[PDB]
Amino acid sequence: QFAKPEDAVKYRQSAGTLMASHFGRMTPVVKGQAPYDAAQIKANVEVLKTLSALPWAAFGPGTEGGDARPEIWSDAASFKQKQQAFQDNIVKLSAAADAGDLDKLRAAFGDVGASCKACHDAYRKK
Amino acid sequence: QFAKPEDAVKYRQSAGTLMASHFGRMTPVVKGQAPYDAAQIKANVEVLKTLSALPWAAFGPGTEGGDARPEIWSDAASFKQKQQAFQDNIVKLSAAADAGDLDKLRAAFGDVGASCKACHDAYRKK
């Protein structure tokens, strides 16, 4: 869907921006510094679920650039494993939210955050 | 969810970027220059549905900036009418996609595009 590689870069960076907001806005809730409303979090995690599937298709043929490290395309299976595992972690966060289980949410939230960081550490330029 | 107004601006601009990609990537389909696969379009319009609800909450208290015109906050009801009408048009696009009706999709797509433009013309700085 991208006329030029720059358009893929702009897309995936914007998807990252929105994921960071929908993930990070729950930090005060997970820490107990903001109240826990199960319906609010369920709805927010649904948004995050949708967003979480979006970046990967924007690292397609010839879309090199931005802060993507070149190791993304040459090791296609290792990068894939990481995005599929991140989305696995998102499924677990969805389950916690959908159940209205705050302890479960805390734990799942930490696992998601670790998955974001693991990918950035390997595949995003400093 | 925004620490500073700049963070709201960055969010809403990224939501716009993603909407433009998910809406605009269907142009060749609506024009018949790319094939119509009803399931593909149904899934894409579902993504667009989710995204289409996101910008509005990022024009909240004290989030003035970017290319938002100041008329957005002082005429809160007129701006609201426009975003709710745009989302009405999105519901109609969803219906067309969900039905697998290409003629209906064409018409609904044009109505959505007109709604984007009407809001930008009134509320987005040149």
Ligand code: HEC
């Ligand atoms: C690999 C499987 C990743 C996972 C999982 C997550 N991110 Fe990511 N992210 C990744 C790359 C390779 C890049 C660079 C893209 C480019 O071309 O520059 C990014 C970028 C971001 C950004 C910065 C966007 C920008 O302003 O330029 C953000 C804010 C971001 N990513 C957030 C984010 C979050 C919150 C994630 C987990 C919920 C997450 N990413 C996972 C690769 C991967």
Ligand code: HEC
């Ligand atoms: C008002 C009810 C709007 C509707 C409907 C749509 N958009 Fe919008 N858009 C609006 C404003 C006020 C702004 C400016 C935000 C800012 O603070 O700068 C925007 C911006 C965009 C952008 C540019 C983002 C950027 O790169 O800075 C894009 C690409 C965009 N909008 C796209 C878009 C599409 C495709 C829409 C219909 C599907 C749509 N917008 C509707 C206000 C409104």
